[PDB]
């Protein structure tokens, strides 16, 4: 169990596979990672970049619960968790904050109106599914890619060997198969 650049790259490689594979059930984990990064290094990316990605991840979590048929009581609990009532960057501007706050409120009201079972609910769910489908997810993945590129710039020279070293400490005496997610992260980040 580790820290430092290796720990950041482990969570980045895992998060990169989660978003590429569209594994919405692990999107909350990507959110904690990005929230940890923002707390220590707010200068990695602009505030608008960070919040666009985080809100996209939150919205998809809520949309997925709706599309999988979860009870509306559970949809609304996750909605209020990820989008609560309340409530920071040298260029954490007002125009970007306006658009960020505005996007939250329209999504909140959209989900609330869906939870009241309007007569055209089925039509609205197919619109919601398109609205937060493939093109939305591709743009989201692009935001994460640029975020992780900024993380790699702030880290020392990568070393591809750490994952196998760390996994052997956690699981001594057994054969650990090389992680494809780890190797794909190194390819996408341009590792030697």
């Amino acid at each position: 169990l580790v820290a430092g650049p290796a720990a950041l790259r482990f969570a980045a490689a895992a998060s990169w596979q989660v978003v590429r594979g569209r594994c919405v059930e692990h999107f909350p984990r990507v959110l904690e990672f990005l929230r940890s990064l923002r707390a220590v290094a707010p200068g990695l990316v602009r505030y608008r970049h960070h919040e666009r990605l985080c809100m996209g991840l939150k919205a998809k979590v809520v949309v997925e619960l709706i599309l999988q048929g979860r009870p509306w009581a559970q949809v609304l609990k996750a909605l209020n968790h990820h989008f609560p009532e309340s409530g920071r960057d040298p260029k954490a501007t007002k125009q970007d904050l306006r658009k960020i706050l505005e996007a939250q409120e329209t999504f909140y009201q959209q989900v609330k109106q869906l939870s009241e079972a309007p007569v055209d609910l089925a039509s609205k769910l197919q619109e919601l599914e398109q609205e937060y489908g493939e093109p939305f997810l591709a743009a989201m993945e692009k935001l994460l890619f640029e975020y992780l590129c900024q993380l790699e710039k702030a880290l020392p020279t990568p070393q591809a060997q750490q994952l196998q070293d760390v996994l052997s400490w956690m699981q001594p005496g057994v054969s650990i198969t090389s992680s494809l997610a780890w190797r794909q992260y190194g390819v996408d980040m341009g590792w030697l």
């Binding site: 990605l53 960020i100 996007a103 329209t106 989201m140």
Partner: peptide, 12 residues
């Protein structure tokens, strides 16, 4: 149209 999360992610 008021800004949505969708359009905010898609823009720029």
């Amino acid at each position: 149209k008021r800004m949505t999360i969708s359009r905010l992610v898609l823009e720029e």
